[PDB]
Amino acid sequence: RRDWENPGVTQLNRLAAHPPFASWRNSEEARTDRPSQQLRSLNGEWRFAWFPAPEAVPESWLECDLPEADTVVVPSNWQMHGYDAPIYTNVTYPITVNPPFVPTENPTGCYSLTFNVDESWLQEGQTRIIFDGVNSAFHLWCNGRWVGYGQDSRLPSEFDLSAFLRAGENRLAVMVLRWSDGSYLEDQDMWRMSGIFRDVSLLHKPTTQISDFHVATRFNDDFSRAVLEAEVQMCGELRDYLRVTVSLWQGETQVASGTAPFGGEIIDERGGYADRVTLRLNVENPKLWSAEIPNLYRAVVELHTADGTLIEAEACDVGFREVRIENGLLLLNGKPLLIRGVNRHEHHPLHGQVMDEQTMVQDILLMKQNNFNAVRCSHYPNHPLWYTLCDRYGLYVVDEANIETHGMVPMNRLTDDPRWLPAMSERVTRMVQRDRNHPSVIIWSLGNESGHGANHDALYRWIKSVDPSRPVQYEGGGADTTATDIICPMYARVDEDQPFPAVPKWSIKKWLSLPGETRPLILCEYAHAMGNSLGGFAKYWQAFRQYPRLQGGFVWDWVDQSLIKYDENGNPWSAYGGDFGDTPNDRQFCMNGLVFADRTPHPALTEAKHQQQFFQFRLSGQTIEVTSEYLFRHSDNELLHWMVALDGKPLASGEVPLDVAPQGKQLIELPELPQPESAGQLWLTVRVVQPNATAWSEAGHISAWQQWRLAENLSVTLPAASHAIPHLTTSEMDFCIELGNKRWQFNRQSGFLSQMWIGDKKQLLTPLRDQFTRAPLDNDIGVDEATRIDPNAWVERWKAAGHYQAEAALLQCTADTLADAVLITTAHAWQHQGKTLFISRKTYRIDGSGQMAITVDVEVASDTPHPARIGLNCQLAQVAERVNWLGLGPQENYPDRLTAACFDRWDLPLSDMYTPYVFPSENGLRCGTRELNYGPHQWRGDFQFNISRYSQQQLMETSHRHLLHAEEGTWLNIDGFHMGIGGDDSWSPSVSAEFQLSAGRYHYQLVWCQK
Amino acid sequence: RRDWENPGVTQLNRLAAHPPFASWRNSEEARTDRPSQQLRSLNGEWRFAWFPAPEAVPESWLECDLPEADTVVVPSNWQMHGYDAPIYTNVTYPITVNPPFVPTENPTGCYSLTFNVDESWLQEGQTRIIFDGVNSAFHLWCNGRWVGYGQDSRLPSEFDLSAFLRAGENRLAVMVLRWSDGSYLEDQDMWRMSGIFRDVSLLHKPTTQISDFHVATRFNDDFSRAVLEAEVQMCGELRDYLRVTVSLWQGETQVASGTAPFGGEIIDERGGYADRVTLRLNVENPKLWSAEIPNLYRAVVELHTADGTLIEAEACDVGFREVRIENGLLLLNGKPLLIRGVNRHEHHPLHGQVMDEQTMVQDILLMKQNNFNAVRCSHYPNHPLWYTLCDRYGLYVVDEANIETHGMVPMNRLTDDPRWLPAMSERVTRMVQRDRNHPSVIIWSLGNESGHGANHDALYRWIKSVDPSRPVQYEGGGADTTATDIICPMYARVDEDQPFPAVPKWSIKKWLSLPGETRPLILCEYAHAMGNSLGGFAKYWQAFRQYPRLQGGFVWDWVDQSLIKYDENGNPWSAYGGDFGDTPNDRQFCMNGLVFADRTPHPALTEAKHQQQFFQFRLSGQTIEVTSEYLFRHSDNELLHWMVALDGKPLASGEVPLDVAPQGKQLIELPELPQPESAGQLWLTVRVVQPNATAWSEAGHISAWQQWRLAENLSVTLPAASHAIPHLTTSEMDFCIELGNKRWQFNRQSGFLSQMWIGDKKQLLTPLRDQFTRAPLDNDIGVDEATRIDPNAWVERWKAAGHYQAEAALLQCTADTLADAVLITTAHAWQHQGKTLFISRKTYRIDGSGQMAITVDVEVASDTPHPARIGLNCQLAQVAERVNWLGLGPQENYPDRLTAACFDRWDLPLSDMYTPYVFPSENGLRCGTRELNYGPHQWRGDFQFNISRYSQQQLMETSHRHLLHAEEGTWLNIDGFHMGIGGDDSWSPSVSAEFQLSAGRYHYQLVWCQK
């Protein structure tokens, strides 16, 4: 019947959706959340054979294992075992757009398992199989007989096997299709994979059973009284002796309990639900759930006879919290939230889209350690364990339906079509039925990038009707449609409007106050963290803090979707789109994470942590004012450490207990600090330290920091009068300068310093030259292709203007002998096709102390695109182990992403001065640097620098980090000025005006000496 | 696969729904609505075989005609051809409630047709087959090859036959199932039938085609300017040369036109619809559509080339009107509606549920002639022609989705279940897609009696999104849920609350002003017209007129659902539930009509016509004030006739043209009327007559009437002195009175007048006795049955109290001789089990003029249920041809249903004094009667009476009208007092307090003489 090419058939013989069941037959096991004998895992070694189409599958496979089959681990994606290629495409569907049809060549995965069933399971009750995740559609047979069919890759499909099984050995056969009509609703920007990629389980339920239960918590005005309402539904043999008991536990203490027979209130002319009961439990002074303090109770639902026979028990964690929107604000337990969120795909570099507990916990720990309090399930319901972990560790969750039709033209072509309403309804309704009891879920989402269709409006109303406890949001069709309670745009900028036709992205500040608008605004996606990014992140956070109705957002996104491949030597490397022969593909656009695929942080993670801090600081004279942004908790695991240093030299430090109420303030007066006689800038650094370990952090965890300049004493002392005078030697081709053990050589044809000697050892492999370009960042490139040129992207503007190919023409090169120095004066013009782009005028003053003072003045043509940098570069002959600097660090920082960096004396291995972005670009810059030390060299001034074994040219020319080779010596880039990195999005120019090098004239000065 | 036991499969290979198409290939034929050669009817003689289940159908039937098959007319219901029994059940499902399963014995109708097509249809283009109505589900084969499957009995199912067609003879095979999962949504209170019961057609469209079009009309503040917006969608290959023109025609004049290429506005990030276009046409001073003046334009939609070649055209009638709810009022073109509505099922006594143009037109004519302006499609989409007729004749329509789940427990079991959302959605969405261009449709309804579920809220929102031009209503779950724009209760009473748990029926006046309530109230069902009913109808209309937000209602219902059966002699009779061996059944509950099945009016229809009049009248002195209730039309076809009569004798008359603006008033001063010295009451009668014929009425049509009492001159003159004196003869057993040739005999054992003679001829066949009971009306019975007794019903209260069994104990019987008269005095006690129910005290005075004056004083025990009547009855020996009376008439009238009746001298054949209700009961009463003449007899007083060949006993004991036999002589019932008939509903006591006989003591007087 080709059910996989029919959106009218999304399942056959599939059981109703419900909250997580375990069918405990002992109430104490249910209370403690211990394993249930009635819930078995079928994970492990299965048999697998790959076919190019379902028509290629032999009939014998239904009755008998195929000899050519392999033994593989389940859950798995079959692409991860090498059976066919994973495909990375963003918007464009991986199949021809011809709904509801899929390709005749439809990769088919034939899974089978021989497994044991105990006689006891078949003597009574009901045995069901549960497939938590099958991508994208499947038929199931048991012992050769057809059972049913399922679609929706991201929710459990359950089938009754009671009539199919025999005692002892049984065989399942599962035919999994890569493509189905469901694929039209699964166009998320991610790797396209397939298989049985979540858990498989066997569940025994009694004939008379709990078939559904809902838990709600309502509160009085000040949250001092609550009512827990539990609606319980049964299936099977309905009798007067039946009862439900709901008991509520706080650890080992029972706080509340209620018992009732079945038979709900009358609801209409035909009566009520005889198979339902609602229990209402009064709870005095409930401990409330938040991401700050994830207080949980345990609810045990016992189905039993009145006279005391437990039939079965189910249970869940209960978090007492109210979510409501009032007067334009999203409130949790009466207080306005500030969402420090991130979007998180389910991705593992080795296992693909298979999730494990260890990876989930690792992610949650890192998120909380970096001041995140919220996660969006981009863009599908997650593995069931995710919600349990968010309940327990404390993260707010946006649970999102598995509906994305991005590649349709227009985007709402399916979502406005009533014929696709059934398929869409199932993806929304079965999510809600599964996840509605989790306190961590605070907002429902209708899916992602599917335009706005009448189906969205219908399903919005459905959710509002069945679950009034949670707002519903949806970004499609302009972010503020009738299908959303929250204005939830993606990549709307802070101040700048983007007035696209039909779906404009207004400035978020402006959006709030459009005529008639009252809703809160929380960005579903913002700060696109692709490669060297998160420029302008601080601008979002300032706006969030200033505007009550700007309640935060979810960063895009958590983890790079890179996959591991192996070279000829068997060494692993990170692969992206196209690396598996997948075509068409979207190359590196799958890597947008704050962390690498192996969960190593990108530098941008520290900027997020800092801007998302829960304590705010102000300094007034000697007094530090600390303000708490916590809504519910006191600062009961926090001390403030302070330190004052003079140009990195510690002068005084202390620690003070933090005792701040939520939303409260504490004033801390610093002790009397002695005025230092020595020249330099005094800097105050404060850090909030957590003395005690928590569920999510180690003792000594730093949660917040801030820095201020204190008193500065400008140096007025003159350097000691030099004994010697440098000697100049002139030839037609060179100016040569000598002083003691030092020599400098300036080439008179090029006008550059071409060599230096310390003692007898040469210092340069390439001359010291101006540099006005950078190896383009992902944000500089956007959607620019070799086959599809985007002329608006920064890289294309620079290329078209000739920035990368401009040749220095020498205008002036002179030498003068002074009383105590030699002065070299140069001027160069950079030209492309008769156009002068830049002029650089320099002096080099070499004095009797051996120091070389370099003054640089640059003119930039007003009509050329603003340059990426204004600086110098050279390749140093030496490779040293360490890099030591006085300036911002320790991590990579750029002009629009340097708030997290602190001014101090930093010392790192050379390798740490390179950031291994999978797609290579300009990287490793440190800004605000006053002194740099490397080998025998010292540079002083006020500059930005990077230092590495890789030239800008190599970074520019290499597509993958594993293909980079260390060059001879060390490439040094020292910039007077560097352009912002941007990142509001990564497909259009996003560098704000104040971070563009538009001044026309630029001045910087450096001293180069030997330390 | 048993697709008929799966609510997830409602169709296979079915084409999208759309407005009525004809694929005109000539624009003038489209404009004039003439036949299209591309649309063929397949109605006529088909081959048919009946089977007990689909499993019994032989495979050979797919390939060739079954020899055992019969030739039958299609469309038809196979029950009407006698292949199996139609079932009448109200609430209880006709199948075991076990969703989604149906009985294994599932009557299966195998239809086939041999046909050929035009050569050119085999050449190119798309040939589809359209089944307008198949009950309840079907599979389709063409030339032995399976095509598809369909459900929903009340909307067209269309399938592409292009790839199945062959040269020469083709064969259709249609397997129709009586029961399917669709049956769970089709539990309407009606006969349960099956088959291909609406049209079958073939439609040949081009491959490049108009696939959908929507027409909208928006207005400025005073309706002097309109914009017609037409959205047009195509299927097939897009070409740059393609255009759409929409032209608007007022008869033969083109008033507006717009032309554009395809390609709609940008709607999201992916662009717009390249396969759609919206045309906007400015219309100055549009003629507006209303039921009062159904002004229509013709919209012609042409798919054509830029250089003028027509590809195809579609078209519809356009009515310019705005429907909105504002400030709690339902407005049409800015004016508040008063709905004079009726519910109408599609029913024919011979053809079952097959509708034809002639019957539809007959219904509309009768509805408009009886002052109805609105119809509710209870409870499913109607035959497509219905809406066209309502567009053109002018009736407001509520279009209702084919969803009723009344028999579920509770009522919302399916409608609150997300697994039934897909099946429900199609029944709503496909109705809107079909009917949205009809101006007569002003309100969408989500179905009937299915409780209130989340699926209702979802679909409510879907309609509001897709079609903002019409309010959405739904009565289920308490009539004021979140799924309705209009408070739309069924059988809510005017003043009396019915505070049922969960779903109370408040007094409609009270309902409006409940805290927070703002919506209009229009009863979806009221005034249940079952048998002798419509008591208290005037109370509704008084309330509707007084309360702005009470905007009327829909009477239940238009036509009795009786079916024709034939007796042994071939004579037809009207049959109801159970008469076909159908069991369980709900007997006469299928007959609730204002008209009989053959469209003959019940007496109740005139009460409806009168109360629904469009002119209101007041009298002050000699001035008649006429007020128009029309919203839009002037009284341009109206003449007022007035007449004054003294006790039925015409005294003066005249006529005046009505010249009244909508909502306006006209004063008409009556001339100087001559004062009659002759005693009696003067009565004024006015009637509004339409001099000119219309589309819906004949010349001379009476649309309104009213009566007033004018001057009364009481008679003070004494009658002529008696010439003779009556003589008394006494025996132990009798008092006999003689005067001339007249004799009266009073039985001294019984205490009643047992005989009268004129000469030798006996006048009585049964003695003249008190009567306190009536043959129970349907309203007296309710849901009371032999198997399940309902003690609250009036009939059960009367039976339990012994009213029907009470025996007359004689207390007193005396005779006195006066100066000119003989006086008989009697007293009787009616008792049951020692309890005295009633006491009757009488005097009979027989004077020398031969007149018998009867004075009756009755005492009714306060603790007995109030009696049905207080009167006398006898069986007269005489059978005469005519009945002449001075009182209310000419039609049957009761105390709570007599406003339409007029006081005058009436003269009818005896048969007209009997109302042939299919279920026999008390009938034919006429009230307010001062004089009754029958043969030689005259009765005078102030009484109610009925007169017929049927005793109350026979009417009470006979289940069907055709089983009644004329008894010897004539049964006369003369009541001093008669109880109301009620009818607010027919399953609970509904007679209002003021019409119950609760006064305890009653007096009346009569004179019996020979004329």
Ligand SMILES: [Mg+2]
């Ligand atoms: Mg499918």
Ligand SMILES: [Mg+2]
């Ligand atoms: Mg216990």
Ligand SMILES: [Mg+2]
């Ligand atoms: Mg046993």
Ligand SMILES: [Mg+2]
């Ligand atoms: Mg997308």
Ligand SMILES: [Mg+2]
């Ligand atoms: Mg700072």
Ligand SMILES: [Mg+2]
């Ligand atoms: Mg079905």
Ligand SMILES: [Mg+2]
């Ligand atoms: Mg019903």
Ligand SMILES: [Mg+2]
């Ligand atoms: Mg009247």
Ligand code: NA
């Ligand atoms: Na805010």
Ligand code: NA
């Ligand atoms: Na991406």
Ligand code: NA
């Ligand atoms: Na503390």
Ligand code: NA
């Ligand atoms: Na690169």
Ligand code: NA
């Ligand atoms: Na009204």
Ligand code: NA
């Ligand atoms: Na009925």
Ligand code: NA
């Ligand atoms: Na007139």
Ligand code: NA
């Ligand atoms: Na009867």
